[PDB]
Amino acid sequence: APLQQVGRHGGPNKCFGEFQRVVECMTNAKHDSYEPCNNLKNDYLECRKHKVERYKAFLMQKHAEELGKDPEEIGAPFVRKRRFLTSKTLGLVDGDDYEIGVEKI
Amino acid sequence: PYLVAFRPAVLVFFFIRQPIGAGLLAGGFLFWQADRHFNFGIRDNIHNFKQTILGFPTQASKWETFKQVDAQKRAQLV
Amino acid sequence: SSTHTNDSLNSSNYVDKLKDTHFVFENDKLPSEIPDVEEVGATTAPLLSAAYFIGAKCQDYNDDFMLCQKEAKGNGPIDCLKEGRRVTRCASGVLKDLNTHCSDEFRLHWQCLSFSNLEYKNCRKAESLLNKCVFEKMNLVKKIPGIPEDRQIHLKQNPVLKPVALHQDSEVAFKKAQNENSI
Amino acid sequence: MDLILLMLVAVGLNIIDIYIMIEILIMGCTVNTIYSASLDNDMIGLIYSLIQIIIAGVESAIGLSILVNYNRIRNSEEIE
Amino acid sequence: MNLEILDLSILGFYSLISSNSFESIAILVATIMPVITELWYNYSQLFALLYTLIYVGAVVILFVFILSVINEKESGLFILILVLLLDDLDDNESNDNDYNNVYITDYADWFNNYNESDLSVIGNLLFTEYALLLLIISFILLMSIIGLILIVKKD
Amino acid sequence: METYELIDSDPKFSRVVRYFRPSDYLTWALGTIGAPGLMVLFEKIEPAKGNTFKMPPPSIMRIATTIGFFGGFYYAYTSSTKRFWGYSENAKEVAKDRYEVKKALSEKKSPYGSSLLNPYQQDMSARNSTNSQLLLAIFPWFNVANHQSHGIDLRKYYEVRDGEENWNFTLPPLDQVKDLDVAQYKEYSNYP
Amino acid sequence: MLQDLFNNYVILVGILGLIFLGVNYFIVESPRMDENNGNISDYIEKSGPFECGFSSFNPIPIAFILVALLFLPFDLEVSSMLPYIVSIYSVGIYGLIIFILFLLILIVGFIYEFNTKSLSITTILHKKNKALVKNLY
Amino acid sequence: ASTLTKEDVLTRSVSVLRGFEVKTKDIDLQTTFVQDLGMDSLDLNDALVALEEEFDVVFDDKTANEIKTVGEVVDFVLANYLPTEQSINHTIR
Amino acid sequence: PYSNTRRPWVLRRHIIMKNSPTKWARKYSSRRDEREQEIKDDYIRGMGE
Amino acid sequence: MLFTSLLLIIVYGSLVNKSHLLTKLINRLGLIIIIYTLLIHLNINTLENLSIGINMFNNLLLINSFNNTIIELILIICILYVLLISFNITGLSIIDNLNYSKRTFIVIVLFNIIGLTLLPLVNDIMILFIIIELQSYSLYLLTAIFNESHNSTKSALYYFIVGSIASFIILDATVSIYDDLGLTNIQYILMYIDKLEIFDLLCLLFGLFIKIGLAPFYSYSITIYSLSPTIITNYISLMPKLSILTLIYIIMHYINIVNNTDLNYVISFLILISMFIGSFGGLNVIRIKTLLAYSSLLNVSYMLLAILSNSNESIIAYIYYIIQYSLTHINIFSIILVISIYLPIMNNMLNVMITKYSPIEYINQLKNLFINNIFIAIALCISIFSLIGIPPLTGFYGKYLVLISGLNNGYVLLSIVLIIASSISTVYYATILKVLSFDTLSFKDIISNNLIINTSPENNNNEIKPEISNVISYVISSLTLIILLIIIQYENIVKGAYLVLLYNWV
Ligand SMILES: CCCCCCCCCCCCCCCCCC(=O)OC[C@H](COP(=O)(O)OCCN)OC(=O)CCCCCCCCCCCCCCCCC
Ligand SMILES: CCCCCCCCCCCCCCCCCC(=O)OC[C@H](COP(=O)(O)OCCN)OC(=O)CCCCCCCCCCCCCCCCC
Ligand SMILES: CCCCCCCCCCCCCCCCCC(=O)OC[C@H](COP(=O)(O)OCCN)OC(=O)CCCCCCCCCCCCCCCCC
Ligand SMILES: CCCCCCCCCCCC(=O)OC[C@H](COP(=O)(O)OCC[N+](C)(C)C)OC(=O)CCCCCCCCCCC
């Protein structure tokens, strides 16, 4: 049966494993109907888009407001510029805030 | 990567060729770029208006949906 | 290959700008019940130099870790952590051993690799010194599975593909041992 | 403001302008495919995109070949 | 400050005021270049090049080839600006608010020790897995070669 | 339905041509000379020019034979293929196939043959050519590779049917035949 | 990997383009300096077409138009062989046999244009001759 | 198509004729050219060429010495009126 | 790296390239979202039971 | 068989000189190629073994007993079609030399036949978008085969532009489905039939609706058919519908898995409008090709009612309808191509211009056909009566079977409208029959040697010289009696329709 969801290196990508378990569930001879494979199909679409997972993030962002919580103290610290991943930010003991080299590897 | 080189030339030729038109499209472009920078909430509310009128699931409707589910489950424990 | 992915740093800061990429840190640690392990602290050049010596010393432990993944049925990261520490500890063993036994030959090799684009074909002379010193202190022999013994590439006397630029330290150390050890 | 068919104003008033709009429209479907193939990390979608570029290329040639013959027809008197 | 938006705003203007076939051709190039550049960054670099080699290199210089053999003959400003400003209000082609405003990540894996370019995989599949697609496309190109001659060649 | 024994769900090109019954060559013989004849008969039904019979040009009688030759082969090729799939009488063929497969197993050689294709490409070349004959009218495609997805159970070549005990064949167990799935993955489960 | 250095190069060439545009607008002497006779827009004589001095008032052949149209197929053929270049090894013999078929189909296109002489510019409008024959009565 | 009728030619013909020195301002189909309007060779050619500029119909050398009345010219335009061929842009789009 | 997954700006802002039968359905029709909202809502309805 | 010999003809075509005798004989080799394909196809393909459906070419193409029959139908209609160019239709060189000038006419047909047969078999979106182009391009090339003509070229340019828009609509839907699911193969998509956006399959059909000319997209098909030469219109107005109505049926078979009520209403809106436009459209028209173009729209409207209903009676109705309308369409266009030899000749009024591409263009050019050739007129009347629905002609059972499937699924409104549009349409089919015979007796005593057929010289004046070619007359005679005498074999033939299966099984 033809391949789907081939990663950039020629092997299965992230969401192929969830795709195979749908095909195995559907074509199996033991199932009277396709009712058993309803959750397996919901996981495959979850893998590709993460829509349910993104919804859970929308609620957490929305719910953090109503209690007065600030994202500075609950959120995950992040750096937005790739030249400012400084050794001080990286946690190196002797590191200093100078810009790192990203001009040419 | 070709537009990055061609962008300096065309922007110059946009103001020289049609100066009055350039001052608006570029001026209007800076407004929305500023608007998203400063969280003016305009384009967000222009967006929420469309989702309300056209029956789409709005951001407010989901949070109202969560409240209905939240309020129901809590009284189920009692 | 060099395609933009969502997992590691992409080509240019403009790519990060178009995607609005955020580089996120996690300040937590592994939960207390998960035993602690000291991660391997070697960079690319030391590992590429010692990739085969790590394989010889840790062959039984590499296979168990990868076999555990197959038998975990997609649940590898949680069901093969105990096996994951065995591979890390064995790998740290070889790097420490190469540092207290063959320290001179080790640095001469991976410094040649850093000098010549990490390509194994450009540092044969710094490698023959390391293989001989390792075999006389750790009993580890480099082997490339699948082909006969007399067809392994690093034993070819006249390789067709030689480096454009000769490493000076590789030539000096080779000639220093050319007459002393190899009388 | 697309439900008022605004794009028809943006099209030129010649047959060659209609040809351009179609190729722009077909190019929109390839950019969407490359968007879908890359995010899914799927190389099957990138094969589809390669076929769309190749197939849409042939359609361009056949269209201009018909147009050139059609345009030659008006100036096909050839008396001298 | 995404400067990609400004360029499209310009192109959304000269498309409305286009008068002769010079303007329409320049619309095609001015559409391809934002396509090529936004693909060179962001999503796929291989197909940013494959556009230039095929779109511009084959069709667009054939557009201007035939156009020189066709012809060269010949509201206001507030309406065109008003049309653009209202058209610019909404620019979310999708309506999944959670899928648009929430960011994601992927976790890298070291299993693919055989790293290869995306073109090698495409060749490894288009020439083996889906050979029929390749052989039909060759057949289509054969039809065009015979097709283009019969239409144009008078004799 | 008139089913029979399923010899080979994906018969090889060399084996399909080998199992041509003498009738099959006759079909190919008719088609190769039928095409020049049909061109002649068409002139009999109505001449191309005028109102009188005129034999078509000798040049056309040459190309029509080529069309008939490559046309009449497929009628033979399709007739032989239906005997492999089980759609046509294959009592003669089953005897021939079982003798060769038993001979292959007896000599400790694969029934299918050695291949230049890695295990994936064998699987890939199975899907491309299997059942391709159902479109052989529209465009040709043939199974020219020595793959192994022939949709059979090799143990059906172990038990001895009627009239086969005389061949005196000895068959080793499947785990010792060169070029088989069961006898290839002995060291690494990822590589043959 | 890492094309920030290339990005700066692209910026520099773009910036360098304006310098070609602008340097003339600043270095050249103003119209009043040389002869003052008129601006470029006003000097219609200079700002006009050149036709070897004398004032005057592309219907290209079929072949030239036909060569251009046939470029589109053959260019898509060549540009579709890119996948086989980076994967010539892994596809092995199977890809090589497919690749040759992908050309033999296109060779028939090449063969067809060869026989009909579609590429030749052709000279039928002129170069006609006849043999004089006496018509004695 | 040819949208000119007989009246349309006749109505617009007078205006051109009202633009040239004519003995009488009453001109209809029965009116002549040389007699009623007193036009000689050069005088009559300008009016005949002028109707060529408005009706966009060319008069040949055969009819040159055979024109005697203004009704003939009005009827001639109908028999010899065609719309100029429109380029590929005007026709179909 | 956490990043967005939106379509290219040229896809959703060209005056021509953004118009197609399926793109208008995405942009102006709630039929796609009403169904796909139920799955999201079921995540919170299926917890307490 | 097609691919092997099509390349042979392409190389052989340009090797020999350009002469109408060599071209005609090469056209006959096209007939022989198609005939062999049918024998080779029938030899290997059976209804019994294809009932399950057999995947081919890495599951890119899937063939079952339903798609198999249409492939056999497509090949057979092409065999009758090539008899129009491989043999003389009229006999007079002036009107028949148009079919022999273009050598690549048969080559283009064989390109389209490969596209026609593979289109119902597509099982992946990647190969769907390709195969539709192989067929679509072959139509545009065919419409422009006569490049000296001004109308034929303008037809192809108009055809190319609309067909490209339809291709983009088809392409966009497949990309939208790919974006939601990430899968390509249709059988893989069937697993997610409950979670993809079902209207994206409707956007796919809207592309296919344009190509077959369904209202409100009917405008271009009528214009194109009325302009292309009669030898061309006979092929481009029937073949694309054979290979697309089948594909539409397969997609509709998949869509009815979920049984979306909103999707039926939208398609029923198009079906309802098409019967209105296809019936009232042809009331006020003077061209015969424009009339048959409106007839084609109405009979496409009737078939789509069976496809939308999509039950076990739809297969019986659609299979029978597509076969009978194809033969009738061949029969009428075969007659119109032959009765061009009775045209009068002047010796003016309205300055009516008749070109050698379409010698018969207006309905009033069929006058006194009852007088000139009564047997031909009866064949034309029988063919016209079938489209009306006079029982027991083949046309009557076509509407009887469509109404059975339409009413069985609750399409009460569309069934009543289909009947009203059947009654309205009868007006402009009777007009054809009024022209032929209604003035027979007032013109029984006529002196007329001014026919086109009278130009041919008298060869012997003793031997009997038939007015028409042997082959083309025999095809008309064979098809005329099939329509009239179908009552004998109808029960057996319908039994043959019972056996056609599309995943019915049990
Ligand atoms: C800042 C905001 C910017 C927004 C950009 C667009 C501005 C608005 C442009 C015009 C909008 C009209 C179309 C509106 C969206 C399309 C219809 C739709 O999607 O539904 C929305 C609206 C009400 O839908 P609703 O009942 O709320 O659905 C909730 C279900 N849970 O549905 C309706 O009831 C709308 C009324 C439509 C019915 C009358 C119009 C149809 C008849 C004329 C059609 C024109 C001719 C078309 C002919 C078809 C061709 C065959
Ligand atoms: C390197 C950049 C150089 C840019 C030179 C032109 C700058 C003007 C802005 C054009 C770019 C905006 C995108 C729209 C495409 C052009 C369509 C157009 O209408 O161009 C108009 C141009 C200026 O003439 P204007 O007076 O403004 O308009 C009325 C003319 N009767 O008159 C013309 O017809 C253009 C004549 C030259 C055509 C050259 C080919 C077009 C440019 C291709 C390279 C630019 C790539 C696009 C860059 C912008 C992307 C948004
Ligand atoms: C007892 C049994 C008898 C059986 C038949 C009974 C029903 C017969 C119905 C006939 C009644 C109307 C016919 C006569 C009324 C005259 C109509 C007309 O001429 O047009 C009038 C109007 C414009 O006025 P004007 O053009 O000046 O005409 C003046 C004529 N004195 O123009 C109009 O008003 C036209 C109205 C617009 C057209 C609307 C069409 C909607 C569909 C109408 C039914 C068609 C069938 C639909 C279903 C089949 C096709 C899907
Ligand atoms: C033996 C078993 C096979 C039967 C033959 C089948 C092919 C016919 C070839 C015979 C030779 C021929 O055509 O000879 C030519 C004759 C007569 O021609 P005419 O009209 O008088 O022209 C004038 C000829 N003069 C000048 C000699 C008088 O034409 C026919 O007979 C026409 C019969 C039509 C074909 C009938 C077959 C229908 C099959 C239907 C399947 C779907």
UniProtKB/TrEMBL annotation, chain A:
Its EC number is 1.6.5.3. It comes from Komagataella pastoris (Yeast). GO terms for molecular function: oxidoreductase activity. This is BA75_05084T0. Keywords: Oxidoreductase, Ubiquinone.
UniProtKB/TrEMBL annotation, chain B:
One of its GO terms (molecular function) is oxidoreductase activity. Its EC number is 1.6.5.3. It is an enzyme of class 1 (oxidoreductase). The chain crosses the membrane at residues 11-32. Keywords: Membrane, Oxidoreductase, Transmembrane, Transmembrane helix, Ubiquinone. This is NUTM subunit of mitochondrial NADH:ubiquinone oxidoreductase (Complex I).
TrEMBL record, chain E:
One of its GO terms (molecular function) is NADH dehydrogenase (ubiquinone) activity. Belongs to the complex I subunit 6 family. It is a multi-pass membrane protein. Its EC number is 7.1.1.2. InterPro entries: NADH_UbQ/plastoQ_OxRdtase_su6, Nuo/plastoQ_OxRdtase_6_NuoJ. GO terms for cellular component: mitochondrial membrane. It catalyses: a ubiquinone + NADH + 5 H(+)(in) = a ubiquinol + NAD(+) + 4 H(+)(out). It comes from Komagataella pastoris. It comes from the Eukaryota. The keyword Mitochondrion applies. The lineage of its organism: Eukaryota, Fungi, Dikarya, Ascomycota, Saccharomycotina. This is NADH-ubiquinone oxidoreductase chain 6. Core subunit of the mitochondrial membrane respiratory chain NADH dehydrogenase (Complex I) that is believed to belong to the minimal assembly required for catalysis. Complex I functions in the transfer of electrons from NADH to the respiratory chain. The immediate electron acceptor for the enzyme is believed to be ubiquinone. Core subunit of the mitochondrial membrane respiratory chain NADH dehydrogenase (Complex I) which catalyzes electron transfer from NADH through the respiratory chain, using ubiquinone as an electron acceptor. Essential for the catalytic activity and assembly of complex I.
From TrEMBL, chain G:
The keyword Transcription does not apply. Its EC number is 7.1.1.2. It comes from Komagataella pastoris (Yeast). It is an enzyme of class 7 (translocase). It catalyses: a ubiquinone + NADH + 5 H(+)(in) = a ubiquinol + NAD(+) + 4 H(+)(out). The keyword Plastid does not apply. Core subunit of the mitochondrial membrane respiratory chain NADH dehydrogenase (Complex I) which catalyzes electron transfer from NADH through the respiratory chain, using ubiquinone as an electron acceptor. Essential for the catalytic activity of complex I. One of its GO terms (cellular component) is mitochondrial membrane. This is NADH-ubiquinone oxidoreductase chain 3. It is a multi-pass membrane protein. Keywords: Electron transport, Membrane, Mitochondrion, NAD, Oxidoreductase, Respiratory chain, Translocase, Transmembrane, Transmembrane helix, Transport, Ubiquinone. Belongs to the complex I subunit 3 family. Coiled coil: none annotated. It comes from the Eukaryota. The chain crosses the membrane at residues 6-27, 62-85, 91-112. It is found in: Membrane; Mitochondrion membrane. GO terms for molecular function: NADH dehydrogenase (ubiquinone) activity; oxidoreductase activity.
